[PDB]
Design a protein around this ligand. Sequence first.
Ligand SMILES: Nc1nc2c(ncn2[C@@H]2O[C@H](COP(=O)(O)OP(=O)(O)O)[C@@H](OP(=O)(O)OP(=O)(O)O)[C@H]2O)c(=O)[nH]1
Length: 516
Amino acid sequence: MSSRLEREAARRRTFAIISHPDAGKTTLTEKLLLFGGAIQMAGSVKARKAARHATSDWMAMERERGISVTTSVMQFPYRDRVVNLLDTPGHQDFSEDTYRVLTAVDSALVVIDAAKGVEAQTRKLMDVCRMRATPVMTFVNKMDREALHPLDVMADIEQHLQIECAPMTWPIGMGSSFKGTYDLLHKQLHLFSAIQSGIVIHGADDPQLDEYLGDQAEQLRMDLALLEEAGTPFDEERYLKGELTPVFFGSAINNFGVREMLDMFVEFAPGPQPRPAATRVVEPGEEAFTGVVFKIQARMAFLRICSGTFTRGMRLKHHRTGKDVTVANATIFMAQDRTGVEEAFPGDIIGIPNHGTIKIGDTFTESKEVLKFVGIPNFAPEHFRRVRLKNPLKAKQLQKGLEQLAEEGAVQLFRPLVNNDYILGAVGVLQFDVIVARLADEYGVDAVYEGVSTHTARWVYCEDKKIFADFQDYHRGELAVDAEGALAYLAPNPWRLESAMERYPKVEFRTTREIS
Ligand SMILES: Nc1nc2c(ncn2[C@@H]2O[C@H](COP(=O)(O)OP(=O)(O)O)[C@@H](OP(=O)(O)OP(=O)(O)O)[C@H]2O)c(=O)[nH]1
């Protein structure tokens, strides 16, 4: 029946966490790792957390490359599945890279702070998942602090993440009155105390509820009947379509409620899925190795394995340059206690060292066939700046530098139609600081920034050749070309954009565009 590869490939579970800041992603991640026996990685995740708020000597330690790479892809075994959890940079580090990580996961898990509910970064990231039709599992965290009512929390999720909510575990009480969770499908009761085997409940009439929950038993029975009416039973097919999301309540800090969520994930989360290419749809089943670059770092290119098997001694062909590339000493991301020939299977991540001459989306194969993976885009930035050059004779240099950095994708570049200025857009503002320093160290250029009216950008496309031309004349003042030669409308804010948009309903204004 199944092949060695098709099995190995299917044990994979590749996901990232989409969360707003301070929700507990780091805490939950460390918790997940401990379940996978990933003792050391878990240490690293914890050590880094600690080092942020530590003395100066550590801040200088966490900010280094060696570590932010080890924890960038964290793999651990769980219930014989190989879970590949990809770090999604947040806080100060939030950038386009975060979105790109979402272009490499078969699925995602949402983590919500119960007190805050759905916040801005949660919505933003979910926005990405929706367009790529990526199934999501939801974990409502921090039930030990006072929080929103669970029904309120679902309502919040449903409204703002535009998806149905299927609760799997329900919380009894909250804050100081947090007793634990009742797992609806398994008819088990999990008490919070200072993991543990749960208690079987037979019917909602079980006196055990009274025994363990006391006067709070009434609320669970109260809540459960409400649920069994306006309730969405987890439906596997609907989850995969993205229409529905399983919800879990817990206290990551206390390693509570996590087990159930982890189990749901290994059992039902998607394994490596087919990937589109220009010529055809690559299947993870195929023996021939294929991979797609989704992240780059200053040089190493992280690659998601799309089909086949990766080993050190193998030879890969870089299609864009047409070159032949060596992976002799790559980075294979794998759980500690390796114990096997060193190989990677579809859904895994590998770090190919390659100097320059790469882009986001580049395809590497084993065979002599032309193949080009598609669908990893650039995302419209929220933040813009105009780059000013102090010494005008260095203009040829800045131009090289910026064009090269954008090809590499450290930032997005916009050249207005009515002037010679450079406007940089960034998914997160940190990118601007990175760009300045790199421009100096790699290109010998001191560049400054200046503020601009612009807060919004959309890529414009129109079928009616006359209308599009008329439009381009009217909004000559707001148009720009990006590094990839694409036409972009720049607006001061989303509202001002609608004025333009309602005037030209026949012009499309996209928030993404494919790379070449
Ligand atoms: N009560 C409660 N708190 C939780 C829970 N999970 C995480 N936290 C706390 O929330 C803060 C953010 O957690 P992170 O895990 O760093 O969140 P993030 O990665 O999403 O930014 C931390 O507090 P901090 O004070 O900023 O740092 P720390 O010194 O406490 O680690 C952490 O201890 C939870 O389940 N219950």
